[PDB]
Amino acid sequence: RLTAYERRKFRVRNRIKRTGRLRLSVFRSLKHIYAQIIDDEKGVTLVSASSLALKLKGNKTEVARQVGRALAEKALALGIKQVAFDRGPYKYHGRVKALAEGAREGGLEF
Amino acid sequence: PRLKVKLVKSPIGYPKDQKAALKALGLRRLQQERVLEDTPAIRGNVEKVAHLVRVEVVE
Amino acid sequence: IVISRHVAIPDGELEITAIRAQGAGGQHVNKTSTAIHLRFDIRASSLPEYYKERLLAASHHLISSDGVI
Amino acid sequence: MEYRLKAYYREGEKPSALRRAGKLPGVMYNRHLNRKVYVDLVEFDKVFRQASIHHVIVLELPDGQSLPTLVRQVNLDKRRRRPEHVDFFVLSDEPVEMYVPLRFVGTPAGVRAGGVLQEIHRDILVKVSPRNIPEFIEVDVSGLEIGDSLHASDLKLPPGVELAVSPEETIAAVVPPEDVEKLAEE
Amino acid sequence: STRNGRDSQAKRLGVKRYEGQVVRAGNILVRQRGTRFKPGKNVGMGRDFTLFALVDGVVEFQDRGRLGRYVHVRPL
Amino acid sequence: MLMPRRMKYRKQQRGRLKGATKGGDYVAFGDYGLVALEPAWITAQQIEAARVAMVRHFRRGGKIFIRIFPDKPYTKKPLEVRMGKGKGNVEGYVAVVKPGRVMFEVAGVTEEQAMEALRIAGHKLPIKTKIVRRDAYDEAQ
RNA sequence: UCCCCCGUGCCCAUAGCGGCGUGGAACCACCCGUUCCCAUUCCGAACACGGAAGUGAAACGCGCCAGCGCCGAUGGUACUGGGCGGGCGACCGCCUGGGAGAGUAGGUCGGUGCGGGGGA
RNA sequence: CGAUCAACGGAUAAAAGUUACCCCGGGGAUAACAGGCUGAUCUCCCCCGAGCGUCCACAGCGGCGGGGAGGUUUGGCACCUCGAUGUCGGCUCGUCGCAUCCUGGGGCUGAAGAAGGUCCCAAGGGUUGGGCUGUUCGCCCAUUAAAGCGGCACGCGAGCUG
RNA sequence: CGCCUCCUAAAAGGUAACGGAGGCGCCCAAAGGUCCCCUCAGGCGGGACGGAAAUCCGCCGGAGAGCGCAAGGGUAGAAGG
RNA sequence: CUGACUGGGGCCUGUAGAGCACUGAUAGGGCUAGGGGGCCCACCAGCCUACCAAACCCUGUCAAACUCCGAAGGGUCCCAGGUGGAGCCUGGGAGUGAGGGCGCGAGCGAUAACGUCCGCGUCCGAGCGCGGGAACAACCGAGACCGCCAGCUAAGGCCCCCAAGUCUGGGCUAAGUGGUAAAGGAUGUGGCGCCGCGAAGACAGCGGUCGAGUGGCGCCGCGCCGAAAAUGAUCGGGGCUUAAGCCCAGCGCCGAAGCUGCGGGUCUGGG
Ligand SMILES: [Mg+2]
Ligand SMILES: [Mg+2]
Ligand SMILES: [Mg+2]
Ligand SMILES: [Mg+2]
Ligand SMILES: [Mg+2]
Ligand SMILES: [Mg+2]
Ligand SMILES: [Mg+2]
Ligand SMILES: [Mg+2]
Ligand SMILES: [Mg+2]
Ligand SMILES: [Mg+2]
Ligand SMILES: [Mg+2]
Ligand SMILES: [Mg+2]
Ligand SMILES: [Mg+2]
Ligand SMILES: [Mg+2]
Ligand SMILES: [Mg+2]
Ligand SMILES: [Mg+2]
Ligand SMILES: [Mg+2]
Ligand SMILES: [Mg+2]
Ligand SMILES: [Mg+2]
Ligand SMILES: [Mg+2]
Ligand SMILES: [Mg+2]
Ligand SMILES: [Mg+2]
Ligand SMILES: [Mg+2]
Ligand SMILES: [Mg+2]
Ligand SMILES: [Mg+2]
Ligand SMILES: [Mg+2]
Ligand SMILES: [Mg+2]
Ligand SMILES: [Mg+2]
Ligand SMILES: [Mg+2]
Ligand SMILES: [Mg+2]
Ligand SMILES: [Mg+2]
Ligand SMILES: [Mg+2]
Ligand SMILES: [Mg+2]
Ligand SMILES: [Mg+2]
Ligand SMILES: [Mg+2]
Ligand SMILES: [Mg+2]
Ligand SMILES: [Mg+2]
Ligand SMILES: [Mg+2]
Ligand SMILES: [Mg+2]
Ligand SMILES: [Mg+2]
Ligand SMILES: [Mg+2]
Ligand SMILES: [Mg+2]
Ligand SMILES: [Mg+2]
Ligand SMILES: [Mg+2]
Ligand SMILES: [Mg+2]
Ligand SMILES: [Mg+2]
Ligand SMILES: [Mg+2]
Ligand SMILES: [Mg+2]
Ligand SMILES: [Mg+2]
Ligand SMILES: [Mg+2]
Ligand SMILES: [Mg+2]
Ligand SMILES: [Mg+2]
Ligand SMILES: [Mg+2]
Ligand SMILES: [Mg+2]
Ligand SMILES: [Mg+2]
Ligand SMILES: [Mg+2]
Ligand SMILES: [Mg+2]
Ligand SMILES: [Mg+2]
Ligand SMILES: [Mg+2]
Ligand SMILES: [Mg+2]
Ligand SMILES: [Mg+2]
Ligand SMILES: [Mg+2]
Ligand SMILES: [Mg+2]
Ligand SMILES: [Mg+2]
Ligand SMILES: [Mg+2]
Ligand SMILES: [Mg+2]
Ligand SMILES: [Mg+2]
Ligand SMILES: [Mg+2]
Ligand SMILES: [Mg+2]
Ligand SMILES: [Mg+2]
Ligand SMILES: [Mg+2]
Ligand SMILES: [Mg+2]
Ligand SMILES: [Mg+2]
Ligand SMILES: [Mg+2]
Ligand SMILES: [Mg+2]
Ligand SMILES: [Mg+2]
Ligand SMILES: [Mg+2]
Ligand SMILES: [Mg+2]
Ligand SMILES: [Mg+2]
Ligand SMILES: [Mg+2]
Ligand SMILES: [Mg+2]
Ligand SMILES: [Mg+2]
Ligand SMILES: [Mg+2]
Ligand SMILES: [Mg+2]
Ligand SMILES: [Mg+2]
Ligand SMILES: [Mg+2]
Ligand SMILES: [Mg+2]
Ligand SMILES: [Mg+2]
Ligand SMILES: [Mg+2]
Ligand SMILES: [Mg+2]
Ligand SMILES: [Mg+2]
Ligand SMILES: [Mg+2]
Ligand SMILES: [Mg+2]
Ligand SMILES: [Mg+2]
Ligand SMILES: [Mg+2]
Ligand SMILES: [Mg+2]
Ligand SMILES: [Mg+2]
Ligand SMILES: [Mg+2]
Ligand SMILES: [Mg+2]
Ligand SMILES: [Mg+2]
Ligand SMILES: [Mg+2]
Ligand SMILES: [Mg+2]
Ligand SMILES: [Mg+2]
Ligand SMILES: [Mg+2]
Ligand SMILES: [Mg+2]
Ligand SMILES: [Mg+2]
Ligand SMILES: [Mg+2]
Ligand SMILES: [Mg+2]
Ligand SMILES: [Mg+2]
Ligand SMILES: [Mg+2]
Ligand SMILES: [Mg+2]
Ligand SMILES: [Mg+2]
Ligand SMILES: [Mg+2]
Ligand SMILES: [Mg+2]
Ligand SMILES: [Mg+2]
Ligand SMILES: [Mg+2]
Ligand SMILES: [Mg+2]
Ligand SMILES: [Mg+2]
Ligand SMILES: [Mg+2]
Ligand SMILES: [Mg+2]
Ligand SMILES: [Mg+2]
Ligand SMILES: [Mg+2]
Ligand SMILES: [Mg+2]
Ligand SMILES: [Mg+2]
Ligand SMILES: [Mg+2]
Ligand SMILES: [Mg+2]
Ligand SMILES: [Mg+2]
Ligand SMILES: [Mg+2]
Ligand SMILES: [Mg+2]
Ligand SMILES: [Mg+2]
Ligand SMILES: [Mg+2]
Ligand SMILES: [Mg+2]
Ligand SMILES: [Mg+2]
Ligand SMILES: [Mg+2]
Ligand SMILES: [Mg+2]
Ligand SMILES: [Mg+2]
Ligand SMILES: [Mg+2]
Ligand SMILES: [Mg+2]
Ligand SMILES: [Mg+2]
Ligand SMILES: [Mg+2]
Ligand SMILES: [Mg+2]
Ligand SMILES: [Mg+2]
Ligand SMILES: [Mg+2]
Ligand SMILES: [Mg+2]
Ligand SMILES: [Mg+2]
Ligand SMILES: [Mg+2]
Ligand SMILES: [Mg+2]
Ligand SMILES: [Mg+2]
Ligand SMILES: [Mg+2]
Ligand SMILES: [Mg+2]
Ligand SMILES: [Mg+2]
Ligand SMILES: [Mg+2]
Ligand SMILES: [Mg+2]
Ligand SMILES: [Mg+2]
Ligand SMILES: [Mg+2]
Ligand SMILES: [Mg+2]
Ligand SMILES: [Mg+2]
Ligand SMILES: [Mg+2]
Ligand SMILES: [Mg+2]
Ligand SMILES: [Mg+2]
Ligand SMILES: [Mg+2]
Ligand SMILES: [Mg+2]
Ligand SMILES: [Mg+2]
Ligand SMILES: [Mg+2]
Ligand SMILES: [Mg+2]
Ligand SMILES: [Mg+2]
Ligand SMILES: [Mg+2]
Ligand SMILES: [Mg+2]
Ligand SMILES: [Mg+2]
Ligand SMILES: [Mg+2]
Ligand SMILES: [Mg+2]
Ligand SMILES: [Mg+2]
Ligand SMILES: [Mg+2]
Ligand SMILES: [Mg+2]
Ligand SMILES: [Mg+2]
Ligand SMILES: [Mg+2]
Ligand SMILES: [Mg+2]
Ligand SMILES: [Mg+2]
């Protein structure tokens, strides 16, 4: 049996991988918020960023725009370009959205 | 090696594909003997018609 | 076989001759028909013997003198 | 008795051939072993009819090796109704699941009423060690009557010899007879 | 005395390019009713479930088990 | 007097009888049995004629098991009609029996009584039959 | 390179179900709130935001057990491409090449890629 | 946009019957007769032995079922014959089969005798005259040793009838 | 008498009979596009009228529900609400 | 050079078989709703059932329009072999669009038809040309350019009709079986198996005497009955009996318009 959570998960991630951009996937825990650019043809994570990792800060949301802007900076340097925003099972919102807007400023294309 | 394949029994009344085999082998008359490279392809056709042929090994 | 309303009648002591067709319809009536049935039920065989006796003394066509039906 | 049967390893031999010669072909195996064998037909048979899958057969192989075994399955030929091929299971020390016969002791009062005893298992599945192979397991069918039944939950048992089957399984029953007055109705 | 006797024009369904076959963008690779094959990489599905090559390349069939079977076109 | 009480389909095509029986080859209920030597359709009115005869041989008996049952519909066009204009009407049902199947068994009765009851029952069947005892092989299946 | 945990994929039940059993430093959950963003055909249950008393109860992770489930040989058979014989039939055989399904032995309480936080 | 053009690739915008008063071109590509193949149907014969026969399965019978033979019935097929193979029934003339109606020989009998029943062997010979109907068939009269059943293109119309 | 589904059909496709079975000659302004959320039948226990079945609560439950309509194929990682 | 046909390799597939997990069918037993009946009892429930019986379970099965499973084969693409009255392309001219038998797979029919309808294949058609099958379009053998008073074979044959063995070794059969049939019945006869009762002397005869074997089953071979049809009989005929029959195993021969030898003709390709 699957949970509404496990489905919504699949339901979005499916549609996403269908368009075949790089996957920017976002986990958001109660304490922290994490992000990875993934190429799921090669099965490999390319560029990574988080709150727990960059050790900050923080207001839960404002932490995000940072870990967002964080990822782009790094990312862009390794050559991306563009990418598809995986919203996981999470209403596109902030912290989740507040990332994103974070990545978008840093130059990530989407 | 080589295969020496002699056609000893008539294909009349046998299926067209076995007739075709006999052609890919190159045997057109009764009693005719042909000396044939032994590859897998040749052997396949030699086996397909095996009930019309007498085979023996050579060269 | 032969499916009379209460008892029996058994399982083949009855005689059905196929004879030729009287009247209309050509060589086929002259020839392949036939297709007509005479029958013989000879009154003493099987039967309750109450049918046999109420059957034997009755005055009817279809029921012969020696009859035989 | 402890039943002994000769037996011989075969390799390329076509079973058609063996079979033709009077040799019923078979395999033997367990967790550590698998080997292609045959026995003699008429000889194998001598045993099996008294033996079956109930009692231990001991195969005496030409290498002198002699292994204790239970018959697992006989593959019959449906047309002839003759054994085609035999599975020999080599017992070792462990316990093993297997089939233990039933003596149904005593005459049911379901019979003697005019009824009939339907033995719905002539034997019973059981986990048990090969030291423990009971020559059989008895059951009192005397208190059984027309309509009545016996479930293996109420089966007696030795030590041990744990059942392997739902004790809800049904080992015996006493059914009413075939009858002619039944005819006219039906 | 028959209520029967009908039947319908037959539909020529099934895979139209097998694995290893070279296609061209646009090729129909499967004709099907519902989804007997899911479109994999570079293969699209049309409103009737027909699958077709999105690019020129080589067919590959994939069996993902529980997930179903897929048809991919490996580009060249 | 044996037929399905319901069918998915009313009439069905004839098919062949190749081979020996899918199974049904070993005894499995009673003590003694009747096995089929030849393939055939067995008509319910035969299967029942066969049953009945044994029950009568027992007069008040053991058990009679019936291991084949007539689920195939038997069709016939009425008499004198020509070819076509549909498929005929179901006039009976048969059981399909390929060789080696055990059709009847008996239990609860003496060896001499099964040897008879199964023999007489045999004659009502339209094929060759063997009488059998329980073996060890029937017990090991 | 090794152990742990968090994310993602791949295999596609040997990965499931059901019993026990363990973990809270970390991570994760549950948890404290409902001002604010955002929400309920009613409900802060869910979604969502601001937190950090507490607890691993629930869930999740890691372990053990074979009751079910799942997998499953070897051998033999059925069936058969091709070649041949038998019968009035239904049908029955042989040769050569392929060869199941069920059943038995057994197996299984997952394995693995990339990336991160920690630990040795 | 206007089609039950639904006989749905849709002859006209517009259309039903009868012919024993009938005609032509064709077909044994196709029916009615006969034959043939088949043998479901029919006729005969066997298997089994429930069960009748006071008693007793089997003198005589034979539930439910099973196997066959014949090619006389009705059919199924559509194979020669549609540049013709005249159709029922009668008469005349026969000849053959035997699954025998009589006559000859036998076994069993629920065969005292006399008569019967049933089966077996037997085709040499025989197998009547009338009333009714076109009839074959059948019913009926009077007899009889008996008043047999089939085959021959349901024998026989370059032999007759009609 | 056209169209669709299944079988016959001999594991590509196609395949006949006055062979076995059924449907169509409509429909939907939402039954359409997209974004977002949600998950069934069924079973056992619980509960005013309340029953076999109205609505409510729990536990079990891969899909046997649903998908306007016949059948088939597909399908909850949705095509269903 | 691509063709049929074949080798290897990949994908596609749901038949034969098998299975029962789905849809249905389904015998018996278990467990157990609900009916029915007997007991009470109208105080409203309780017991027994050898009755009918849902769900579920166990044993045992069935299915074109069932499938948890599933071959052999088939289809297609690639690479290779394949030079063939192969192949592709553009044109000119057709005829055919009544098929038929046999095999195998099915439907219809009656597990009938020289029956119908499809599928794969073959032959006849057009090979009624040749050898075998007594005779006989399609069964067996074989694809006939012409000539030979030469040779080797095929199927089938080798007692005489009638070319070649009254050939060799083993066995069966006594019916002329061979030389048209079924259920069924039987001290026909022969070969392998299984037990019983036998000097504890049934085993048949009229617990005694006889002195040796007997009695009931299995798997197989060949025969017997079952077996009636209409002009005259018959295996093609004569005739055949340790075969001129049947089974097994050899050797030699005969036998076509097949193949060879020799001569010739024409087409085609090449020197
Ligand atoms: Mg030939
Ligand atoms: Mg051939
Ligand atoms: Mg081919
Ligand atoms: Mg070749
Ligand atoms: Mg009768
Ligand atoms: Mg008149
Ligand atoms: Mg008139
Ligand atoms: Mg008229
Ligand atoms: Mg034996
Ligand atoms: Mg009962
Ligand atoms: Mg209709
Ligand atoms: Mg049709
Ligand atoms: Mg179709
Ligand atoms: Mg069609
Ligand atoms: Mg294409
Ligand atoms: Mg689309
Ligand atoms: Mg692959
Ligand atoms: Mg029948
Ligand atoms: Mg019937
Ligand atoms: Mg019989
Ligand atoms: Mg058992
Ligand atoms: Mg079984
Ligand atoms: Mg991967
Ligand atoms: Mg699975
Ligand atoms: Mg995992
Ligand atoms: Mg704990
Ligand atoms: Mg903590
Ligand atoms: Mg703590
Ligand atoms: Mg939550
Ligand atoms: Mg816990
Ligand atoms: Mg989690
Ligand atoms: Mg287990
Ligand atoms: Mg298995
Ligand atoms: Mg094998
Ligand atoms: Mg084969
Ligand atoms: Mg075969
Ligand atoms: Mg083939
Ligand atoms: Mg074959
Ligand atoms: Mg024959
Ligand atoms: Mg075979
Ligand atoms: Mg083989
Ligand atoms: Mg092999
Ligand atoms: Mg195998
Ligand atoms: Mg297997
Ligand atoms: Mg196991
Ligand atoms: Mg383990
Ligand atoms: Mg497990
Ligand atoms: Mg993982
Ligand atoms: Mg580290
Ligand atoms: Mg119009
Ligand atoms: Mg109209
Ligand atoms: Mg209509
Ligand atoms: Mg028209
Ligand atoms: Mg019109
Ligand atoms: Mg038309
Ligand atoms: Mg059209
Ligand atoms: Mg017009
Ligand atoms: Mg007019
Ligand atoms: Mg006229
Ligand atoms: Mg007039
Ligand atoms: Mg008129
Ligand atoms: Mg006039
Ligand atoms: Mg006129
Ligand atoms: Mg005219
Ligand atoms: Mg016509
Ligand atoms: Mg005539
Ligand atoms: Mg006629
Ligand atoms: Mg004629
Ligand atoms: Mg006949
Ligand atoms: Mg007879
Ligand atoms: Mg008497
Ligand atoms: Mg009496
Ligand atoms: Mg009768
Ligand atoms: Mg019959
Ligand atoms: Mg009959
Ligand atoms: Mg007949
Ligand atoms: Mg005739
Ligand atoms: Mg006729
Ligand atoms: Mg004609
Ligand atoms: Mg015709
Ligand atoms: Mg004419
Ligand atoms: Mg003329
Ligand atoms: Mg004339
Ligand atoms: Mg004239
Ligand atoms: Mg007169
Ligand atoms: Mg006579
Ligand atoms: Mg008579
Ligand atoms: Mg006399
Ligand atoms: Mg005298
Ligand atoms: Mg007498
Ligand atoms: Mg008396
Ligand atoms: Mg007298
Ligand atoms: Mg006479
Ligand atoms: Mg005479
Ligand atoms: Mg006379
Ligand atoms: Mg007279
Ligand atoms: Mg007169
Ligand atoms: Mg007068
Ligand atoms: Mg008059
Ligand atoms: Mg009259
Ligand atoms: Mg007369
Ligand atoms: Mg006469
Ligand atoms: Mg006539
Ligand atoms: Mg006449
Ligand atoms: Mg006459
Ligand atoms: Mg006349
Ligand atoms: Mg004349
Ligand atoms: Mg006049
Ligand atoms: Mg197909
Ligand atoms: Mg096919
Ligand atoms: Mg819709
Ligand atoms: Mg519910
Ligand atoms: Mg409730
Ligand atoms: Mg309450
Ligand atoms: Mg209430
Ligand atoms: Mg309620
Ligand atoms: Mg609920
Ligand atoms: Mg559904
Ligand atoms: Mg289907
Ligand atoms: Mg929706
Ligand atoms: Mg080439
Ligand atoms: Mg090619
Ligand atoms: Mg190939
Ligand atoms: Mg499948
Ligand atoms: Mg099958
Ligand atoms: Mg089932
Ligand atoms: Mg089972
Ligand atoms: Mg169902
Ligand atoms: Mg039941
Ligand atoms: Mg099917
Ligand atoms: Mg089929
Ligand atoms: Mg099927
Ligand atoms: Mg499998
Ligand atoms: Mg395959
Ligand atoms: Mg292609
Ligand atoms: Mg291939
Ligand atoms: Mg090439
Ligand atoms: Mg042109
Ligand atoms: Mg042209
Ligand atoms: Mg011209
Ligand atoms: Mg033309
Ligand atoms: Mg045709
Ligand atoms: Mg043709
Ligand atoms: Mg043909
Ligand atoms: Mg054959
Ligand atoms: Mg038939
Ligand atoms: Mg035919
Ligand atoms: Mg024909
Ligand atoms: Mg012509
Ligand atoms: Mg010829
Ligand atoms: Mg030709
Ligand atoms: Mg001629
Ligand atoms: Mg000839
Ligand atoms: Mg000839
Ligand atoms: Mg002919
Ligand atoms: Mg030529
Ligand atoms: Mg010579
Ligand atoms: Mg020869
Ligand atoms: Mg000879
Ligand atoms: Mg000579
Ligand atoms: Mg001699
Ligand atoms: Mg000799
Ligand atoms: Mg005689
Ligand atoms: Mg003779
Ligand atoms: Mg004779
Ligand atoms: Mg016989
Ligand atoms: Mg017999
Ligand atoms: Mg003897
Ligand atoms: Mg004998
Ligand atoms: Mg012996
Ligand atoms: Mg003695
Ligand atoms: Mg005879
Ligand atoms: Mg006679
Ligand atoms: Mg010889
Ligand atoms: Mg020549
Ligand atoms: Mg020359
Ligand atoms: Mg030329
Ligand atoms: Mg030149």
Give contacts of F85 with chain E, Cβ < 8 Å.
Answer: 1-2
Geometric angle at alpha carbon E69, from E63 and E71, rounded to 5° = 100
Q: Which residues pair with D58 in a beta bridge?
A: D4, D68
Place of tokens 């009817």: C60
- Establish whether the CB of F77 is closer than 7 Å to any nucleic acid atom in strand H: no
Cβ density class B18-35: b for 16+ within 10 Å, e for less: beebbeebebeeeeeebe
- For chain E, give the number of residues: 76
Angle between helices F111-124 and F44-58 (to 10 degrees): 150
Q: What span, in angstroms and rounded, lies between the C-alpha atoms of A64 and A56?
A: 10
Q: Structure tokens of D63?
A: 């290498």
Q: What is the DSSP string of E47-64?
A: TTS-EEESSSEEEEEEE-
The residue ranges of every structural domain in chain F are 29-137
- Sequence-distant (≥ 6) Cβ neighbours of residue A47 within 8 angstroms: A36, A37, A71, A74, A75, A78, A80
Q: What span, in angstroms and rounded, lies between the C-alpha atoms of D149 and D171?
A: 8
Judged by a CB distance cut-off of 8 A, whether residue F20 touches chain D is: yes
What are the φ and ψ backbone dihedral angles of A41, each rounded to 5 degrees? Answer: -80, -45
Convert A53-75 into a string of H (helix), E (strand) and C (coil): HHCCCCCHHHHHHHHHHHHHHHH
Q: What is the DSSP string of D14-27?
A: -HHHHHHHTEEEEE
Angle between helices A60-77 and A98-105 (to 10 degrees): 30
**Alpha carbon of A29 to those of A50, C57, D66, E64: distances in Å?**
11, 111, 67, 31
- Sequence-distant (≥ 6) Cβ neighbours of residue D131 within 8 angstroms: none
Q: Structure tokens of F91?
A: 């006039």
Q: What span, in angstroms and rounded, lies between the C-alpha atoms of F49 and D183?
A: 12
First to last CA, chain F: 31
Resolution in A: 3.2
CATH architecture label of F29-137: Alpha-Beta Complex (3.90)
Domain harbouring E68, CATH code: 2.40.50.100
User: SS3 helix, strand, coil % of chain E, rounded to 5?
Assistant: 5, 40, 55
Angle between helices B40-48 and B16-25 (to 10 degrees): 140
DSSP letter at D122 equals S
Do A92 and A59 meet the contact criterion of CB atoms below 8 Å apart? Answer: no
Q: What span, in angstroms and rounded, lies between the C-alpha atoms of E36 and E28?
A: 14
- For chain F, give the number of residues: 141
Q: List helix spans (H) across D1-123.
A: 15-21, 41-51
Q: What span, in angstroms and rounded, lies between the C-alpha atoms of E73 and E37?
A: 13
Judged by a CB distance cut-off of 8 A, whether residue D117 touches chain F is: yes
| Nearest by Cα to E17 from E2, E31, E6 | E31
How many whole angstroms from its chain centre is CA F72? 12
Do E75 and E42 meet the contact criterion of CB atoms below 8 Å apart? Answer: yes
Contacts 24+ apart (CB under 8 A), A32-39: A32/A63, A33/A60, A33/A63, A33/A64, A33/A67, A33/A95, A33/A96, A33/A99, A34/A67, A35/A67, A35/A68, A35/A71, A35/A99, A35/A103, A37/A71, A37/A75, A37/A80, A37/A83
User: Domain range for residue E72?
Assistant: 12-76
Residue E3's SS3 state is: coil
Do A26 and A96 meet the contact criterion of CB atoms below 8 Å apart? Answer: yes
Query: Strands of F40-43's sheet, edge to edge?
Result: F40-43, F89-97, F72-76
Cβ density class A13-34: b for 16+ within 10 Å, e for less: beebeeeebbbbbbebeeebbb
Give contacts of D84 with chain F, Cβ < 8 Å.
Answer: none
Q: What span, in angstroms and rounded, lies between the C-alpha atoms of D47 and D8?
A: 16
Distance from CA of E12 to the nearest CA of F (A): 27
Contact between F52 and D117 using a beta-carbon 8 Å cutoff: no
- Sequence-distant (≥ 6) Cβ neighbours of residue E45 within 8 angstroms: E35, E38, E39, E51, E52
Domain-located, residue E3: no
Q: What span, in angstroms and rounded, lies between the C-alpha atoms of F23 and F37?
A: 14
In chain C, positions 14-53 with C-beta closer than 7 Å to nucleic chain H are: 15-20, 22-23, 26-28, 30-35, 38, 40
Contact between F136 and D48 using a beta-carbon 8 Å cutoff: yes
Residue A26's SS3 state is: strand
Q: Which residues pair with D24 in a beta bridge?
A: D39
Convert chain F into a string of H (helix), E (strand) and C (coil): CCCCCCCCCCCCCCCCCCCCCCCCCCCCCCCEEEEECCCEEEEHHHHHHHHHHHHHHHCECCEEEECCCCCEEEEECCCCCCCCCCCCEEEEEEEEECCCCEEEEEECCCHHHHHHHHHHHHHHCCCCEEEEECCCCCCCC
Overall domain count for chain E: 1
Domain-located, residue E1: no
Q: What is the DSSP string of chain B?
A: -EEEEEE-S--TTS-HHHHHHHHHHT--STT-EEEEE--HHHHHHHHHTGGGEEEEE--
| Nearest by Cα to A50 from A38, A32, A62, A37 | A32
Residue D131's SS3 state is: helix
Structure determined via: X-ray
Side chain identity, residue B15: P
Do A33 and A67 meet the contact criterion of CB atoms below 8 Å apart? Answer: yes
Q: What span, in angstroms and rounded, lies between the C-alpha atoms of A70 and A99?
A: 9
C-alpha dihedral, A71 to A73 to A79 to A83, nearest 10° = 40
Give contacts of E5 with chain F, Cβ < 8 Å.
Answer: none
| Nearest by Cα to F99 from F40, F47, F49, F15 | F40
Handedness of CA D125, D129, D135, D140 (dihedral sign): negative
Handedness of CA D160, D165, D167, D172 (dihedral sign): negative
Q: What span, in angstroms and rounded, lies between the C-alpha atoms of B12 and B30?
A: 11
Handedness of CA D137, D143, D147, D149 (dihedral sign): negative
Domain-located, residue E4: no
Q: Structure tokens of D72?
A: 């697992």
List all nucleotides in chain I with at least one atom under 7 A from a protein Cβ. Answer: 1, 3-9, 12-15, 17-23, 36-39, 61-63, 72-79
Contacts 24+ apart (CB under 8 A), F8-12: F10/F73, F10/F90, F11/F73, F11/F75, F11/F87, F11/F89, F11/F90, F12/F72, F12/F73
For residue F26, the CA-to-ligand 115 centroid distance in Å is: 56
CATH code of the domain made up of B1-59: 3.30.1390.20
Side chain identity, residue F91: E
- Sequence-distant (≥ 6) Cβ neighbours of residue C12 within 8 angstroms: C1, C2
Query: Strands of A33-39's sheet, edge to edge?
Result: A44-50, A33-39, A23-28, A84-86
Q: What span, in angstroms and rounded, lies between the C-alpha atoms of A50 and A7?
A: 25
Q: What span, in angstroms and rounded, lies between the C-alpha atoms of F2 and F43?
A: 9
Q: Structure tokens of E16?
A: 């139209």
